[PDB]
Curated annotation (Swiss-Prot), chain A:
Its main location: periplasm. It comes from Escherichia coli (strain K12). The keyword Chaperone applies. This is Thiol:disulfide interchange protein DsbG. The gene is dsbG. Disruption phenotype: No visible phenotype. Homodimer. Interacts with ErfK, YbiS and YnhG. GO terms for molecular function: protein disulfide isomerase activity; protein homodimerization activity. It is found in: Periplasm. It comes from the Bacteria.
Amino acid sequence: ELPAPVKAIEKQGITIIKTFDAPGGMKGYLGKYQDMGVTIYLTPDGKHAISGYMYNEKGENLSNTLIEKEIYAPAGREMWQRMEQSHWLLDGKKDAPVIVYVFADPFCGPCKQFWQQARPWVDSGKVQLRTLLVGVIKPESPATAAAILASKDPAKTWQQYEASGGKLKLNVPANVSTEQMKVLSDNEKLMDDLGANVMPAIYYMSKENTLQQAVGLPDQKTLNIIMGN
Amino acid sequence: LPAPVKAIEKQGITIIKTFDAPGGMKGYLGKYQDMGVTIYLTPDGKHAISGYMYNEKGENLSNTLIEKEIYAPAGREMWQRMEQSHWLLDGKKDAPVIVYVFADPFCGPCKQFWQQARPWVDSGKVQLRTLLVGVIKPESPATAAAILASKDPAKTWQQYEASGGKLKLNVPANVSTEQMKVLSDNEKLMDDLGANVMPAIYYMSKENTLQQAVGLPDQKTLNIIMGN
């Protein structure tokens, strides 16, 4: 179905997703190479095609913009909304401009270190952390997570738990209640879909409104990026 | 962070996580713009290599890892949402290759794709699972609902596509509430997937990552959709 120059580019290992309208009398083709988006532009003469990246007068990489909006953004918007709708615990001001979701377990050492790393931004009102608790690392992870979900102020209990390094004493109930069992079960199902079993599993949005991830304790550059610097 | 890795960070790489690599090497998974990157710290601890690691059998382990950690997760939730929808089966229920397609009764390219798929569907290798929507023409909703309302909706849809839309239908007095829900749910999922042109085709790669094709596929894309 494809113009010959585009078929030649196909043979270099590119699979075509869709056509699109491009500037300057050029027809666009969006494709993938090993799951990375690629853009191809058919020239006006119709007898040549260019595989590469298009830039505009303002210096914007329009090919990256298009690949982000058409390939990556839809799955990211959906995961972001799913986390938004889950039972997360608030850490920081409800009006903090930067939102960060974190999967955490009570017996995760690195989760508490990341909790400490976040304090300067959280305690200044810049970032809110939204924790999705799971109970998967240790045998008592489910009950311990359930005990904090059961407390009168779960979000405050979680802060005390992380700040104290897990030394905070709890009243653990006779069993995980059906409501608490649902929260934990849903949170691990969202964690599984996201592909990280190591914690903290940190999710945040790029300036391009694409979902980004950090797993384990971030280094200084990744931390500063997560926190919106 | 080890100094050679910090130098690579300054080239525009944001690190996601560490991982274990062969031979006393530590791995770092990262991104450059939209691109997944692997970095390997040398045993001496004083050098790092940004690139792709291969094993004796010739597998690109960096690509395997980048696919599993960065790309495979993005697809799963959309895939299950399509599975849970009210799709119509075209082919064997046990066919190993599953292909979802958003389609409208008045989409011309959808019927051409339906024809292209016949060799794989008829062989039992591929099942097409059609998510009907009613968006193209004023009569698209009523016609899609009529097909959902038929005695054997999956068979009516196949006959409808095979006939180029000439198949005559029994039209009901209105769209039922369940049919209306099916059409509305399918249209909202299609919107979330970001493609409004049809056929909008969704399928899984050999690497278990979600892929999309929009419009009538060319020969190479068709072979890939069908699992060749």
